[PDB]
Structure 1
Amino acid sequence: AMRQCAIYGKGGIGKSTTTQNLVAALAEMGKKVMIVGCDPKADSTRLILHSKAQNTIMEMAAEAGTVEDLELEDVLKAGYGGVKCVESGGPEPGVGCAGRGVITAINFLEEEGAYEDDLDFVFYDVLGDVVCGGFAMPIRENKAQEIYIVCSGEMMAMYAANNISKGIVKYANSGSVRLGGLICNSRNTDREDELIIALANKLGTQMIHFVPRDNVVQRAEIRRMTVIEYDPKAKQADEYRALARKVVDNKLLVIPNPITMDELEELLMEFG
């Protein structure tokens, strides 16, 4: 068995930083993990690979002719801790559906046997500002059973969490996609942990971890590394280790209860 997890959230909220650090901590623990980038920015694996980014399946298929001319060993790359990494890519802005590459990538990985038995986890890093096309496919097509949403006390980030939850509810009659929890990626604001706990309770889930805002993240990323690799003694490294432990141990996977805009505004008013 392997656990298939997807990380969703609004742009810039910390999906790729949180996912790569979480995965590095899992690898440090002895888990075998694959990361599948499903965001057109295509930098979801750079901290594992010590790289600028990673060439995408869409790009490589075009240079090779067809996706069938690609071999899995050409596309998957291993980095820190043996973590395996792949990027979907997507069409250029203004041309075709921004999520089309996700569909091509996941189908390629399935057919080519990337989901081999001794993997323990797969993480999809998915754009969540819209829930449609290839960005909805992990939910619609039952690819990621456990959704974790990165958010913050920012109104827009909480709105995005509610919108992703509505997409999970829409496909609850088929497959087994469920909400696993919220991850608060702090803006360094007072009572922010309590605010995201309250939001999670209203949705029917939990805040799995509160990730502090810490400048060591930027110092690690300037050097193309996770904090786990860059400074294993950092306080922030222990934060990602705690998040990883709680993801491993999590057993609460729910069909969420989306809230109204009045409820969301009341949350923000109350917690000041």
Structure 2
Amino acid sequence: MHPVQVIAVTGGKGKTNVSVNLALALADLGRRVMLLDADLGLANVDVLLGLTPKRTLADVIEGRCELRDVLLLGPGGVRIVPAASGTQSMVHLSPMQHAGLIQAFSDISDNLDVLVVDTAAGDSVVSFVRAAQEVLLVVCDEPTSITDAYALIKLLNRDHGMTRFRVLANMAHSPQEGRNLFAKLTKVTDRFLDVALQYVGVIPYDESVRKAVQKQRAVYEAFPRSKASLAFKAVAQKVDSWPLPANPRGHLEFFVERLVQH
């Protein structure tokens, strides 16, 4: 009935993992979800630490294994596809690699409602962000957060034709502080760009987040009725209200199409 929704989340990992908690909150609303792990920065350090997964999405694209062979289970049982080890350009794929890409995302799409793409790199990441239906920019009260958010909008706008962005204030100590953050970004993008920002809201500063982090758990899973978790539920409600991709339900063909061109 509905096409698969695809959301890219940029920023927001104060240890506060927005993609994982959004995925859990969406599942709690009855959506079938999956995470795509596209944090290049993290992957690069992990290589030196021997932390690279044995198999990744790149291996599926190369036809070495199937999608089900690379799935990991994260907090609350959310399924994760490792996707930050690609050394190949999504626009210089061979027919064999293209077929592997189609296969990977066909398999990802099976019985799926929402794919959440987690990213942290200004590439072989950006492909996933540009191809996503919605981009969720996570911003906080740290000094460089707003300018980092801006620099990313500038890049996606100028280099990848992207013109609309969702903005979430993470761990804001008050609604006013979240509003100020959005007001600043709006004023700056107003002057230099022609883009449309939309303010999703605030994940409130919450001691439960640290408490969950120290237990190596996601706050939504550990403490589903803490203030931050209730805010993630509300975000998840907003997210299921964003427009779906403009095509009938298929097997994520639209996303693969965007990855390889445009």
* TM-score normalised by structure 2 residue count: 0.70
2:151 corresponds to which letter in structure 1?
N
**Runs of at least 5 residues in structure 2 that lack an aligned partner in the other structure:** 44-50, 190-195, 246-262
1:195-235, Cα deviation, whole Å (9 max, x unpaired): 12313533331220211222211222233322222122222
1:32–1:121 contact (8 Å) kept in structure 2:
yes
Structure 1, unaligned runs of 5 or more: 43-52, 91-98, 254-272
Structure 2 residue corresponding to 1:137, chosen from 119, 127, 130 = 127
Task: Work out the CA distance in 2 between the residues paired with 1:163 and 1:7.
Answer: 15
- Separation of aligned partners in 2, 1:161 and 1:84: 28
Task: Tell me, yes or no, if the aligned pair for 1:146 and 1:178 is still in contact at 8 Å.
Answer: no
- Tell me, yes or no, if the aligned pair for 2:172 and 2:202 is still in contact at 8 Å: no
Distance verdict in 2 for CA 1:89–1:206, change over 3 Å: closer
Which residue in 2 is equivalent to 1:159? 147
Code of the aligned partner of 1:4? V
Q: Which residue type is aligned with residue 166 of structure 2? A: G
SS across alignment from 1:206: strand
> Which amino acid in 1 is paired with 2:236?
A
Q: Residues 127-147 of structure 1: CA distance to partner in whole angstroms, max 9, x if unpaired?
A: 14x2xx2132224xx521211
The 8 Å contact of residues 148 and 179 in structure 1, kept in 2 or not, is answered as: no
In structure 2, distance between residues paired with 1:252 and 1:72: 24
Contact 1:7–1:126, Cα closer than 8 Å, also in 2: yes
* Distance change in 2, residues 1:79/1:136 (3 Å): closer
- Answer whether contact 2:55 2:69 (CA < 8 A) is retained: no
- Measure, in 2, the Cα distance between the counterparts of 1:101 and 1:212: 39
SS at match of 2:179: helix
Shift >4 Å, 4+ stretches: 58-61, 78-82, 101-104, 106-109
Aligned residue for 2:249?
none
Cα deviations by residue, 1:112-156 (Å, 9 ceiling, x for unpaired): 32342531111111114x2xx2132224xx521211100123341
Q: Is 1:216 the counterpart of 2:208 in the alignment?
A: yes
Letter in 1 for 2:173: N
SS of residue in 1 equivalent to 2:240: helix
181, 197, 202: which is aligned to 1:205?
Answer: 197
Identify which of 49, 52, 55 aligns with 2:53.
55
CA, structure 1 residues 145+110, in 2 after alignment: closer, same or farther (shift >3 Å)? same
Structure-2 change in CA distance of 1:80 and 1:39 (3 Å): closer
Tell me the matched-pair count. 221
Where relative contact order (Cα < 8 A, 6+ residues apart) is larger, the structure is: 2
CA contact (8 A) 1:56 1:87 kept: no
| Alignment CA distance shift 1:153-1:222 (3 Å) | closer
| Counterpart residue identity of residue 121, structure 1 | V
